Amino acid sequence: RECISIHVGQAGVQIGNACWELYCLEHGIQPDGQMPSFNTFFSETGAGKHVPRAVFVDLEPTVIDEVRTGTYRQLFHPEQLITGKEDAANNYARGHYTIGKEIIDLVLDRIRKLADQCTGLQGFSVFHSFGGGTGSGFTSLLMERLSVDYGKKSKLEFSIYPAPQVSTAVVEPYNSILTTHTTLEHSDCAFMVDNEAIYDICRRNLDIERPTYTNLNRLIGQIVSSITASLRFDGALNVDLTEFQTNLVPYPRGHFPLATYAPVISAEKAYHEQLSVAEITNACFEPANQMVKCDPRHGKYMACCLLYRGDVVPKDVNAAIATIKTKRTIQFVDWCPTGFKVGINYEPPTVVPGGDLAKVQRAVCMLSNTTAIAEAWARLDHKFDLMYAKRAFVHWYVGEGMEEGEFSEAREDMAALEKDYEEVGVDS
Amino acid sequence: RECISIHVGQAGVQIGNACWELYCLEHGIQPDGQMPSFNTFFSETGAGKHVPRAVFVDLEPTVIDEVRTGTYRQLFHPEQLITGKEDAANNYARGHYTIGKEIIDLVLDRIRKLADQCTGLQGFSVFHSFGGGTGSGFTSLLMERLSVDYGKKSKLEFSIYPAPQVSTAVVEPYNSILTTHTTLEHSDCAFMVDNEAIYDICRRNLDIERPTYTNLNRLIGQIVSSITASLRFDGALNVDLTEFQTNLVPYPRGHFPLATYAPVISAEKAYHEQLSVAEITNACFEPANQMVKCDPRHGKYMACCLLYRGDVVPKDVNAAIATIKTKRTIQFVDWCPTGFKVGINYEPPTVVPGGDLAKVQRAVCMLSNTTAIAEAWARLDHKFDLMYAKRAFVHWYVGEGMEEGEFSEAREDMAALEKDYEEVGVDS
Amino acid sequence: REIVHIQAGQCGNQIGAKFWEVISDEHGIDPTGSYHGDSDLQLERINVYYNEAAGNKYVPRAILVDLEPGTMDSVRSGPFGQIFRPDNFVFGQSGAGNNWAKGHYTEGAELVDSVLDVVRKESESCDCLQGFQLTHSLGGGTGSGMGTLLISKIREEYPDRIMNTFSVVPSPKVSDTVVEPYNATLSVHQLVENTDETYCIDNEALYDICFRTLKLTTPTYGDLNHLVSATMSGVTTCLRFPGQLNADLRKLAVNMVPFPRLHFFMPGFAPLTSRGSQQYRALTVPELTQQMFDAKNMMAACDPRHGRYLTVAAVFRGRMSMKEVDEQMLNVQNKNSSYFVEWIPNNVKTAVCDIPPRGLKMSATFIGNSTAIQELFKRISEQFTAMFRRKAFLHWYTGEGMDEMEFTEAESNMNDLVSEYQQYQD
Amino acid sequence: REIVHIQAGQCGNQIGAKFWEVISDEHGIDPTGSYHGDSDLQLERINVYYNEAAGNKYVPRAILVDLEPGTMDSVRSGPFGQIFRPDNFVFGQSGAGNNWAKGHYTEGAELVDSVLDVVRKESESCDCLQGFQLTHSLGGGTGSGMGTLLISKIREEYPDRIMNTFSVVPSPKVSDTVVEPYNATLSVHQLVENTDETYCIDNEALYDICFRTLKLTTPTYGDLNHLVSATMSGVTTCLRFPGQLNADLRKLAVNMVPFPRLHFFMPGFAPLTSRGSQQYRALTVPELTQQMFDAKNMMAACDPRHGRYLTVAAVFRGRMSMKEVDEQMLNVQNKNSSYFVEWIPNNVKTAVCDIPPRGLKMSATFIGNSTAIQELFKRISEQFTAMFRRKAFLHWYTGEGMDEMEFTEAESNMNDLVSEYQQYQD
Amino acid sequence: SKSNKPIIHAAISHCCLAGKVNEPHKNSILEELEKCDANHYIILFRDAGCQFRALYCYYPDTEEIYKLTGTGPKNITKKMIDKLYKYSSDRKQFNLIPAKTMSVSVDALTIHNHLWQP
Numbered sequence A, B: 001r002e003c004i005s006i007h008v009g010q011a012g013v014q015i016g017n018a019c020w021e022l023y024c025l026e027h028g029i030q031p032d033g034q035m036p037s038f039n040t041f042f043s044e045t046g047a048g049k050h051v052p053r054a055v056f057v058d059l060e061p062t063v064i065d066e067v068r069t070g071t072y073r074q075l076f077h078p079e080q081l082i083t084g085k086e087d088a089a090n091n092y093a094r095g096h097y098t099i100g101k102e103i104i105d106l107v108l109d110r111i112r113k114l115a116d117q118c119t120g121l122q123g124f125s126v127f128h129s130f131g132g133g134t135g136s137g138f139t140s141l142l143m144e145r146l147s148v149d150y151g152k153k154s155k156l157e158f159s160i161y162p163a164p165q166v167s168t169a170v171v172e173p174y175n176s177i178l179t180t181h182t183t184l185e186h187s188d189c190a191f192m193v194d195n196e197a198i199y200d201i202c203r204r205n206l207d208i209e210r211p212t213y214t215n216l217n218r219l220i221g222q223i224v225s226s227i228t229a230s231l232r233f234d235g236a237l238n239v240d241l242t243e244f245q246t247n248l249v250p251y252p253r254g255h256f257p258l259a260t261y262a263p264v265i266s267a268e269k270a271y272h273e274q275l276s277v278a279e280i281t282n283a284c285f286e287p288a289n290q291m292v293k294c295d296p297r298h299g300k301y302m303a304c305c306l307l308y309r310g311d312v313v314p315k316d317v318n319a320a321i322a323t324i325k326t327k328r329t330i331q332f333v334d335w336c337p338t339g340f341k342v343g344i345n346y347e348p349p350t351v352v353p354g355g356d357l358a359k360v361q362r363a364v365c366m367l368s369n370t371t372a373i374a375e376a377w378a379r380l381d382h383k384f385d386l387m388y389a390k391r392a393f394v395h396w397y398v399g400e401g402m403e404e405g406e407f408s409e410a411r412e413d414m415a416a417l418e419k420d421y422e423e424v425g426v427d428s
Numbered sequence C, D: 001r002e003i004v005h006i007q008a009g010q011c012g013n014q015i016g017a018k019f020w021e022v023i024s025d026e027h028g029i030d031p032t033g034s035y036h037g038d039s040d041l042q043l044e045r046i047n048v049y050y051n052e053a054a055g056n057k058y059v060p061r062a063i064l065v066d067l068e069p070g071t072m073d074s075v076r077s078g079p080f081g082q083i084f085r086p087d088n089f090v091f092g093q094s095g096a097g098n099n100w101a102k103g104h105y106t107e108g109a110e111l112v113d114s115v116l117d118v119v120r121k122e123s124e125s126c127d128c129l130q131g132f133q134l135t136h137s138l139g140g141g142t143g144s145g146m147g148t149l150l151i152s153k154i155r156e157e158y159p160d161r162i163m164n165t166f167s168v169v170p171s172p173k174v175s176d177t178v179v180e181p182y183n184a185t186l187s188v189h190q191l192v193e194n195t196d197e198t199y200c201i202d203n204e205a206l207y208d209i210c211f212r213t214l215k216l217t218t219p220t221y222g223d224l225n226h227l228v229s230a231t232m233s234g235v236t237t238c239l240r241f242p243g244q245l246n247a248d249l250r251k252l253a254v255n256m257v258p259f260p261r262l263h264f265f266m267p268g269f270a271p272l273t274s275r276g277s278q279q280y281r282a283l284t285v286p287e288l289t290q291q292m293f294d295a296k297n298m299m300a301a302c303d304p305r306h307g308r309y310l311t312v313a314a315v316f317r318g319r320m321s322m323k324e325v326d327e328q329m330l331n332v333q334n335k336n337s338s339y340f341v342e343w344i345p346n347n348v349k350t351a352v353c354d355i356p357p358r359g360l361k362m363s364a365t366f367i368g369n370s371t372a373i374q375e376l377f378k379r380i381s382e383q384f385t386a387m388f389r390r391k392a393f394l395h396w397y398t399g400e401g402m403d404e405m406e407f408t409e410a411e412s413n414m415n416d417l418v419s420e421y422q423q424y425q426d
Numbered sequence E: 001s002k003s004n005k006p007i008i009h010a011a012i013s014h015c016c017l018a019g020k021v022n023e024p025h026k027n028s029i030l031e032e033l034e035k036c037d038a039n040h041y042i043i044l045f046r047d048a049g050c051q052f053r054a055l056y057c058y059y060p061d062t063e064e065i066y067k068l069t070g071t072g073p074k075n076i077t078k079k080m081i082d083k084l085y086k087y088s089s090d091r092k093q094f095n096l097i098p099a100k101t102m103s104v105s106v107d108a109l110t111i112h113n114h115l116w117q118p
């Protein structure tokens, strides 16, 4: 009946700064822990004040310093404030092997304390990136050790994937190759988040021309709050996370879902707005609302999970599914005939005090498995290829004891990864 | 039960500024969208506010700037506000091909959103001109694509036709030749509007000596509102738009109707007035109220559709039809003996708050198909002939990808157009 | 939809200084760049001319071109120079001294690349350009010669934009050097192929306009340019301000030009009247068109009743009725159809601006192309025939490194232009 | 995460004196060490630079290195020397007199061990070592020659830290002695093996920057170093102050260095403008990146349009939006992919600091590596070819006890340094 | 008639083939542009990073796609094209075009990655 949010890397904290702020919005929670009634994301003491069941990972003090000196610091317990002293220097090797190995003895036992607090552990969720130093190396180290400890629990990664055009660091393809093998080796479900597609959403569906990482993640955490707590909360058709291990990935190694969410309505758009259930689902099939720069038109659809909020009539849902079959440009696969699992929440979606998202009376989250995702991995592939051709950047990892054959190994792990999603689309 | 108004070009937006002002006058609609009850031109949201099912087309910001910053901007949603950034430069080649092709993928998909909102799509109506840049080039591009998308829908153009004496731009005959072929290739019904005859109406039937484009279009949109919404509204003899595809053009390519409307009464003419139904119909056969400078006296009449408003007695209508047969100077054709389709609205006509049109108790709209229209095309023909004889203005279109043989092609298209309407009058 | 105004020479820098004097006064703008106007019309279309800076400051998107600071020294020390940035003050030492071959071919080209780079600095800062505006003299050495290399480079850079310059036509009466018609001869040889259009301005015509119609006593060059700038502002503000017949210049360039080399225009300004005739003359729409039609309102010394009108543009300003506009437009065509071409039914293009100017209730701007403009061109050529034979002070241009047949090729290209107007004349 | 700043020579002691002038002014600190700032940002990261003493006094973690008191005599008698403890004033008698062999090999090493113990005194007093900072000249005999032994011993002590120095590149125009290119030659032969990175500073390039863009009249060396210190402060305060793209220098050293020997960097500073263009220039993100991209904003006399960029670091300061940052970063790559390497899709590393500096709302710091930096090395080497043959005043260095093939070994290492840029050039 | 020839000459001379290192490259190319009779010139690109690969002489009719100058294939099918490019003069940069029939208004393109040989 409980789970854990894990925040590894600078980004995963910065996302969770909005996420747990939205989690305060779930019940109108005061920043001390006072709330009238719910114990799934929280731990309740005798004082009636609730602390999050969360994990804060950083090898620098700096991002933690904004946490421990800002708002909501009375909500957070200093056990969960886990900080480091020396940076990973944006390295996989210092993330996975060198620096994090003297911190992991602290980090794993903090979870085991919090796992001891839980009654009916369903699993946990991890927030990080693919190409980071902390959120790639240490995440590869963390997800390995948690799989050793808790083999039969949920393992969730909602990961940030770098854009093919915009990369804030050069080694972001060079770090993501080694990350992805151990990601596929351990994780049960791994999402991909591309800021470049979200940039197109803000400038068009919200018409916002000055976003920061704040304005990006408030969109993202609103989706995840509908993903996590809303499926935990009561509705008309209640689905849990374990059925996503059932009805979303029918494969041993296939778990890279594509998540969309398309009520994205600016406040000026809101006064002229009549959006039914089916009208949002057509926007979920639009390329402008895919959250990853991709072309799902050329991708075969494997699984489609629908997650609804608020005003839901199930007969209107059946017309929305009938809308999907009629407007077919989708090339849906023949292996599963009609696997379209529905999720219905009775609760209305929430509005950020201070955000730029208008009040709607229905919100729709759609999970998708499409074959065009490997083309983004194919973009990531040649970035690793040309750098390995010149053997650039190799001396930072040779000095840390990493083998050059491991690079071509993980490339073959990336190649066999690209072989696997090709086998879905090619075979029929 | 719904249709779309399309406004392509600088003029068609300026007409529609009066049209939707009259459409607010159809129910006393407040500028927020508040109206007590009707959903044909409108989409109703949950807030009880109605938005127009309209299309606003411009490649300049400027005409849209008056729309989005004036009155009724709380009625319009910026989905319909489609603007460009570079002008078509009054060019067909930039209108039909060069500039508008980067916007047409936006514009067609805006229609498909709004066509998805409709239940019982009956068709649409387009407002443009013959000799414009946007309203001739991009109209030829848009009506082509909509005919591909929606083959079995209504396609209406109420187009402005230039005077033989008054022309605002020199290329207005030079643009209208290429427009007219693709107009005949796609459109279901195309009207011709000449401002010069409307100038004679204002100075005589209203005695107004200072008109603008506002004062012209208030007359025109009052007719179109009686054409479009009044046939959608309840009356005594109710005809829909689809029967005008039946009982107005018995031809594959014959759809250039002539429209008249002659209760045109000034406020001082209102007290020297006792006008029956038949007395208006005699004014409908007058040369001073034809809306196009032509001589219908030398033209053979193919079809005569009658559209009435307000105080109608059908027995008195039958005497008015008998008045037509008695006063014969009309040279009515022998192919159809007595095809005079009648339209009766029970609703009274409206009066613009701010206009100069008096309150009548009966309003009469008459459609006509006559053979003297090709004489205006014959005036347009030699205008194209003398320019092509000198090969004047040729480098603006050959420099943009047009062929000089296409000019003589569309002239032969214009000639065969003049051959077709000659075959109606000559053959008996 | 933005415009850059490249002012050149001792003349056109002084000339276009009056232009931005008008426009900053038009929109209610402080001399230092602050906004003080009261209309959204003066607030929305700032983008076309000015670059918004910090503190509600509007930067003139316009570069002054000279080989000497002294002209710009007068502008910077004078009024409205305080809004100009030092990036637009591009200068060298020394000047050419009214010599076409020095700035175009030998010396000014070093300063040209410094000019063009700042153009590249500003054109990248824009949202979307519509064209580049210029002003100089035909017989101006630094005015035309520098600009003739500029337009050759800008058209090489930007073929997609309108290339217009504002040219001072050499008066047969007013000359300071004798090699002044040499400079206009070498200009038009590249002005035809590189520019999209230009306008024709003669001070000799404007002397009559200030005196015969306005009864002015002592006009300056700026007093002439005070008239020029209103004709300058009458063209392009209709592209900016709203209106019913909103006509682009690129729309106007299509209608006013039947043949791509025939792009030399006759500007005119209709509401010309003195102070004493204010109490005698009513302001109507036919009142302005009668002064549109008159020969004594043209900015070039040509007889329009001698030549024949090719194309006519009718730019109007104010609150007018379309019936009164079109009927008065039609009656001029009804009256003097001998003054027109045969093969066009409507040689007059109407341009109604709904937005009025300040002071007057109505205004109008005449733009025409006629066959009579060859008259001033024959004044160029017939002087050029005698001057080429004797080669008077040719060794100045000869030491710069130019060829005599290049002059003859420029002469033959000028001899083309004499033949070009006659073939559509009758 | 603390930093020691080792300033050396007559130059870099004077140069880095401007640096702590900035930082003490940056955080609101009294000249005697008292705190008077108002932000917790200025209160939290004092540890990285300063050592907190009793009475709210902040000891600069920085040592001035010279064989002469006179430079430190100017600092101690001047402003901001009062915050310095007497332990950091290490000096002897006499100076080398601009001789590399005297400080490194014969004489200065006796004073070096006295310095390094005080380094061991302060680094043990630190909480966590991050890296040691240096600044001198390449042609500085006591500046580099002492430091070449210092970097050799510190790397022998602390391999785990970053070794960076701020070197003055010898200008081809500015020379006081003739054996000045000898000193830069013998430096880099040990700088490549011992330093992790360095920055390139040429006063000859800065003379253009003060004059062509800033329009300054009489620049001093401190006026030069006033520009240098802002580029110095732009680097490491982003490691200190919060931000979204908080990038370590050790993070930066991984991305900016593809080949371990090639770690020579081209610094730049974007918001460069004079007082006249303050009222005339808008403060935007594309405004600064255009001056990031300009060749005339580089602190070293190189043509970046001649060579090709290896790696680019984009340090930003102020309250900016990520979308405007990432697009404007991308558009430079979209325009000038010829200026880059082939085998990397994104040569530009962005470093957005949320914390703004004082005075300006936006600021930025350009760091680049290109193939054009070998141009100044060929200016070193070709002068070194002529000077080695005639052996002019070689007997000064010969009597100190150095070998001629050691110069050739330094030359061959310098010759390979020319080749290592070319093999990745095209 | 219509011609992209000065604009393509304006495209490489300021954006693509800029630099003193590309000056031996473009001097071979500018004379080659004067040689060909086609009014329609198309530049080849590998990716959207705008890296100059080759130059083509495409025409909207069935005239040759033929590789004029640069590294690439000789023959490119209309199936092989992926993304169509144009050049805004004022931005001195490129802009994206939606998928359509290619003609004179198109200035450059990119093609498929498996068509590129390793």
Ligand SMILES: CC(=O)O[C@H]1C(=O)[C@@]2(C)[C@H]([C@H](OC(=O)c3ccccc3)[C@]3(O)C[C@H](OC(=O)[C@H](O)[C@@H](NC(=O)c4ccccc4)c4ccccc4)C(C)=C1C3(C)C)[C@]1(OC(C)=O)CO[C@@H]1C[C@@H]2O
Pocket: C021, C022, C025, C026, C223, C224, C225, C226, C227, C228, C230, C231, C233, C234, C271, C272, C273, C274, C275, C278, C357, C358, C359, C360, C363
């Ligand atoms: C008391 C009063 O208002 O008198 C008028 C005036 O009577 C007359 C004589 C004005 C006056 O103009 C001249 O005397 C004049 C002389 C040489 C060259 C140009 C002008 C006036 O200066 C000109 C001025 O016009 C304007 O301000 C227009 O808006 C004009 N702007 C400028 O020329 C201008 C003046 C000063 C500073 C900046 C700009 C304009 C024209 C076209 C497009 C935009 C703006 C006006 C109304 C007046 C005076 C003061 C006498 C006239 O001109 C204009 C342009 O309106 C000359 O023919 C008209 C007839 C006017 O009646």
Ligand SMILES: CC(=O)O[C@H]1C(=O)[C@@]2(C)[C@H]([C@H](OC(=O)c3ccccc3)[C@]3(O)C[C@H](OC(=O)[C@H](O)[C@@H](NC(=O)c4ccccc4)c4ccccc4)C(C)=C1C3(C)C)[C@]1(OC(C)=O)CO[C@@H]1C[C@@H]2O
Pocket: D021, D022, D023, D025, D026, D223, D224, D225, D226, D227, D228, D230, D231, D233, D234, D271, D272, D273, D274, D275, D278, D357, D358, D359, D360, D363
């Ligand atoms: C009235 C006023 O405020 O004037 C400004 C000013 O106008 C200009 C001209 C300043 C001024 O700088 C110079 O003139 C200058 C000359 C040579 C070398 C270095 C600087 C200014 O001195 C510099 C100074 O900048 C700062 O103080 C920054 O915080 C800067 N700090 C210092 O340089 C500094 C100065 C004195 C003592 C201690 C530090 C900084 C820069 C980067 C990182 C941290 C701090 C400011 C705002 C001004 C003046 C006084 C004129 C400029 O510089 C900076 C660094 O901001 C030059 O380009 C900018 C543009 C500014 O507009």
Ligand SMILES: Nc1nc2c(ncn2[C@@H]2O[C@H](COP(=O)(O)OP(=O)(O)OP(=O)(O)O)[C@@H](O)[C@H]2O)c(=O)[nH]1
Pocket: A008, A009, A010, A011, A014, A015, A087, A088, A089, A090, A091, A128, A129, A131, A132, A133, A134, A135, A136, A160, A162, A167, A168, A195, A213, A214, A216, A217, D244
């Ligand atoms: N959407 C989003 N992306 C972020 C945010 N913060 C950082 N990123 C992205 O994360 C990537 C950089 O990751 P880092 O923060 O440096 O990696 P890390 O896991 O913290 O590890 P270190 O490199 O050791 O600091 C880039 O792609 C950034 O765009 C954020 O708040 N939101």
Ligand SMILES: Nc1nc2c(ncn2[C@@H]2O[C@H](COP(=O)(O)OP(=O)(O)OP(=O)(O)O)[C@@H](O)[C@H]2O)c(=O)[nH]1
Pocket: B008, B009, B010, B011, B014, B015, B087, B088, B089, B090, B091, B095, B129, B131, B132, B133, B134, B135, B136, B160, B162, B167, B168, B195, B213, B214, B216, B217, C244
């Ligand atoms: N009756 C009427 N005619 C108008 C109106 N506005 C313009 N016109 C006519 O439209 C014609 C000119 O067409 P334009 O509107 O300029 O051309 P366009 O199709 O809008 O597109 P562009 O030329 O590319 O700007 C002339 O015959 C004008 O008389 C209007 O409001 N009413």
Ligand SMILES: Nc1nc2c(ncn2[C@@H]2O[C@H](COP(=O)(O)OP(=O)(O)O)[C@@H](O)[C@H]2O)c(=O)[nH]1
Pocket: C008, C009, C010, C011, C012, C014, C015, C097, C098, C099, C137, C139, C140, C141, C142, C143, C144, C168, C174, C175, C176, C203, C221, C222, C224, C225
């Ligand atoms: N109307 C007008 N004519 C001018 C002005 N300045 C110069 N001229 C005329 O233009 C010619 C000289 O042009 P100038 O600008 O000095 O040439 P340049 O500087 O060598 O290019 C002569 O015929 C002058 O009478 C001016 O401000 N206004």
Ligand SMILES: [Mg+2]
Pocket: A009, A010, A059, A088, A132, A133, A134, A135
């Ligand atoms: Mg990290």
Ligand SMILES: [Mg+2]
Pocket: B009, B010, B011, B132, B133, B134, B135
């Ligand atoms: Mg238009």
